[PDB]
Amino acid sequence: DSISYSNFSVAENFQKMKDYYKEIEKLKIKILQLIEAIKKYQQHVEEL
């Protein structure tokens, strides 16, 4: 029963862990798009 009285806290807490990991995936793709834009900046500065 002491494992049964504590299910909701662990459920919603684990749901939070899922949410923050999803948004770490979103910033994980965004950072690579940024580095691509930095490389385009570099070659255009080389052009000017």
Partner: protein, 37 residues
Amino acid sequence: FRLYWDDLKRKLSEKLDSTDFTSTIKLLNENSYVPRE
């Protein structure tokens, strides 16, 4: 007969030293009742 007050609070304490609330508060916290909006 009749039951007056001082007899009757005594009868309440004699009915009250027997009951158990702890088992019922376990019963309302089992897995067949626990989330109830």
